[PDB]
Subunit: 92 residues, 6 copies
């Protein structure tokens, strides 16, 4: 139970909701940008369940799957780009 | 440097990077903001630094990057929450 | 075949490595079981989490205790993302 | 996280809740925090959480064993994925 | 890949440039096809991507590499997985 | 920068060394092949010390910089490729 885990720890569960809510409602970014970031980060972190959920919300808000593929592509690029950064350690 | 060791792949990579960077479905502001979040989400300090300054020199404010960072942190915790449901039978 | 198949010696040694860490007496069994589950969550391996969770449950640990251990791992993942978040500064 | 008012506040509270949860002892949470820090390879977090654990009375050997569990799980999870090789 | 090629359908400009990147690194002359195949499998395992593993394992099998040599490739991924953790662990000792 | 760790737990340490030797001395793959895979995985997992260490041993055995840079390249590819796989959870 994705939330059954929450029932077990009442106090940490509600405090986690406040944190989620606050970051979800923060006004410095448009809802669209925050939704795009959520999907892109879910892909970067490689969490299939999270990606589906955030993507479905992104769709329900008007974001196309094409713009979603672009956010995913950015995550793919950073994934490769960071490996390259580590790659320079092959040199003495 | 590293790229230097391999001419062909380095060129292809450069092209792949410019392609996703020059994509027209998302504005410049959203792509830069996403680059910072992903960098933070995958914990690469070198990547985060470079993309953050690329975004700062494009008008994006520190506070806006902190919010982008916040989402990444939420996803790192959220993703673990999902795995945590596996403690049940 | 198996997770540990085709390679007899590497499989034998991995098991002994597992046994060594599992019977290391500087920590109690309960703590090692809780650490196992917490670590499985942090690394996001579902099958690992489920298996280590069953072993802990069989040893009397509660799913509430297991939930708190996974909660610590959730916090570590969000904290670590924030550590890299302050790499630009 | 001084930059975002409610987010920082709200995160701080989430942290305190996890840190104060009564189902596990302080000792057990100190070992977990360190082992988890090792498992996700965050050196800064490992340092800080190991510092706190040592100041609480936990020895380096105890901390090392916690870390050995983390390494075991990292190796173990990859082998779970290696089963895909065998179709 | 109905799911990965559906991505090709959404972003032809980037997916294509990526397929070219994949091919460049896939056809480099520095390493033999055998080495690149084993490396692809072991890395898929180290990064814990199930689909990637199955996929590269097949191309490795269809290339004549045995499951035995492949299991050893993974075994090294596992070793590096554990070794990297222990490196982070030294941060414990002050 | 990982030997201090082994020190505290003598048994676990020798136990890890045995495992390390069992994989290092596996006949199914050549030494050159084993050294290339160690460097690439070190990059894939993004552990610098590991990359540095394994690369150095690889250089001493005859493998060149360019061959290692290629190894790391496959790692960059797979790191990006595994993200592309997750992105498939978007098309719903």
């Amino acid at each position: 139970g994705a939330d059954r885990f929450l029932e077990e720890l009442p106090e940490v569960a509600e405090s986690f909701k406040n944190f989620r809510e606050a970051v979800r409602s923060e006004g410095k970014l448009t809802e669209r940008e925050k939704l795009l970031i959520s999907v892109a980060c879910s892909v970067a972190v490689r969490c299939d369940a999270c990606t589906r959920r955030h993507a479905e919300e992104a769709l329900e808000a008007g974001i196309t799957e094409g713009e979603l593929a672009e956010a995913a592509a950015v995550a793919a690029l950073i994934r490769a780009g960071s490996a390259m950064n580590t790659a320079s350690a092959i040199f003495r």
